[PDB]
Ligand SMILES: CS(=O)(=O)N1CCC(Oc2ccc(-c3c(C(=O)NC[C@H]4CC[C@@H](C(=O)O)CC4)noc3-c3cc(Cl)c(O)cc3O)cc2)CC1
């Protein structure tokens with residue numbers, strides 16, 4: 001309903017990446033609701049249009065699956081919802097209240113995008129018989145689609161959580177979804193506790209947790225950073241589940257399981273979190289498969305965990321020793337000014353892969 | 355008569371390089387190298403293979419040397435390395451019409467390979483000196499030059515593969531009355547004790563560290579033989595290659611540990627774990643040397659990157675990684691800034707999985723050198 005014209009226009013622009021510190025500025029006394037509106041009514045169409053161009057480059061057999069068609073229809077509707085605001089007055093508190101409601105509607109509409117897109121890959125696999133693990137097009141696309149999705153969810157969450165007028169705010173000292181004083185070990189313990197509750201139900205034994213902090217500059221100081229705790233939680237929950245599953249499965253006896261050891265290091269540039277297990281490990285040749293969408297989980301926990309780490313210029317790396325165990329390391333930027341969004345952009349480089 | 359490969363001359367070298375460059379290098383498995391020792395009737399076979407294969411490998415990489423930017427190619431050190439490769443190619447071409455049935459041909463061939471090995475002994479630092487000549491003349495940081503980085507990885511991996519073929523022939527067939535390591539098949543130890551190679555590399559790095567520093571970290575080794583916990587870990591490998599990797603990693607771990615503990619006489623130890631799985635032999639070296647931020651790891655594997663006691667020559671760590679890759683292994687670094695660094699050597703546990711990784715001169719390679 002005009003959609004191809006809007007997609008074409010907004011696709012020409014590059015997404016504009018923000019630092020964690022710029023997110024904080026948008027949610028502070030340095031900015032207001034009008035600033036967030038004028039930014040987002042341009043930025044959300046650019047990001048929606050850029051990924052919608054890439055969806056339309058998928059092989060026709062993937063594009064025509066019911067679930068991919070459903071996801072494409074949501075993106076089209078969300079783009080048109082934001083177009084209603086392009087000529088509205090930012091000075092008018094009605095415009096701003098209507099915009100917040102439109103973003104809440106979009107967030108609800110897109111809530112199940114991750115499993116719905118995964119269902120479309122399975123529909124493709126179960127119809128045509130091509131293993132999506134081995135299809136490099138689908139793997140390349142899903143990394144960029146899911147990173148795009150994380151970036152759009154971050155923009156919408158920041159606006160709706162800050163400008164809600166949220167009656168009783170969950171975590172009242174957060175700036176939207178950002179904790180400017182995130183205690184990293186508390187997020188580690190919370191992710192471990194949730195993984196331990198699941199592991200106790202299904203195995204009747206879980207490895208213990210051991211945490212060590214190294215604050216290079218200030219030995220005694222409990223480590224804090226500016227981060228989105230839900231993103232950190234998602235990564236650590238996934239890593240704990242895998243380390244606990246490997247530890248339990250590789251041990252004859254559930255009586256004396258080796259613990260999972262976590263080290264949190266704060267350097268000048270990096271906040272590093274290493275999770276070490278004695279779960280028997282993975283041969284080097286098979287590490288790549290663990291980050292493959294829908295490999296032998298719902299098929300996406302570990303690759304999406306790695307996208308959350310990449311999103312603010314971090315990484316998630318696995319280093320295994322077959323016959324012994326596995327180290328997983330989350331690398332985050334220590335400084336909010338270094339934590340800049342990593343966004344896929346629709347360009348010649350992207351086009352080539354498809 | 356005046357056939358292309360007859361009465362070879364310096365003047366003819368471009369034509370010979372063109373001819374041999376049309377063939378692909380033929381990769382051998384560690385298992386095939388073991389077979390080619392098992393009888394001295396294998397000497398004729400080694401000769402007939404090597405008088406074709408060494409010209410092919412020489413010619414393939416010589417094509418890429420000639421694609422270097424003019425200002426790198428013209429350096430005296432690069433010209434020197436290219437002149438050695440040309441002479442070595444001509445030396446082997448003298449054998450193309452000679453009779454393998456004549457024991458004189460075989461003894462002359464072994465002498466010619468020993469001459470070549472001696473001539474090429476300093477190729478690694480000479481090539482590096484040419485890149486430095488380029489850097490120090492033009493002020494282009496070779497770390498950031500993707501052409502030079504691409505070339506050096508392929509050049510040094512080619513060099514490793516040539517040295518392996520020459521070592522296998524000369525150490526099996528030279529007929530040393532009482533040989534140094536009598537249980538080896540050329541340079542291959544079919545019962546390589548990995549911990550002993552770790553201890554030898556540690557001892558040599560500690561000798562160097564004790565020269566410059568008042569203290570050096572101790573060594574701790576742990577073994578996990580998954581299938582047989584009581585069995586000391588052994589594998590089929592080339593122990594000199596494993597030594598070169600472990601020497602480089604010990605030097606770096608010792609340098610980091612000392613520099614982060616400036617006036618300490620009691621240092622955190624360097625811990626090594628050797629794990630044997632069904633597919634992988636993994637060696638992890640762990641230090642408490644204060645670590646490297648993630649953004650700077652890529653630089654450590656860049657040719658001619660520097661931050662001379664245990665300082666680098668610009669190639670130790672990337673060439674260590676080429677030794678791991680040469681038989682389908684790898685060398686990976688993972689650091690934790692403010693704590694320390696883990697380096698992991700991954701080797702194939704099975705001699706049949708250990709196949710030479712060789713660069714081949716093709717259109718794909720040619721493209722990389724194009725503006
Ligand atoms: C696409 S996904 O995100 O949905 N997906 C990825 C996660 C996967 O589950 C797992 C879990 C654990 C393990 C595992 C083993 C182990 O299990 N070895 C035995 C065979 C494992 C496969 C096997 C093969 O594939 O052939 C080859 C060795 N050992 O160490 C780990 C390990 C892994 C991670 Cl990632 C970790 O963080 C910590 C660990 O200790 C492997 C796989 C299901 C789902």
Ligand SMILES: CS(=O)(=O)N1CCC(Oc2ccc(-c3c(C(=O)NC[C@H]4CC[C@@H](C(=O)O)CC4)noc3-c3cc(Cl)c(O)cc3O)cc2)CC1
Pocket residue numbers: 602603606607609610611613641643644645646650653654655656657658659660661665666667668669670671672687689694695697
């Ligand atoms: C191209 S080469 O192969 O010739 N070669 C050059 C010379 C050598 O450099 C080295 C050695 C050690 C270290 C080092 C530090 C450290 O020293 N941090 C301090 C930073 C401060 C300036 C920083 C920068 O900005 O570059 C970068 C180091 N901490 O952990 C390690 C470490 C490294 C390796 Cl590889 C390892 O195996 C074990 C280790 O503990 C860094 C660099 C290798 C690479």
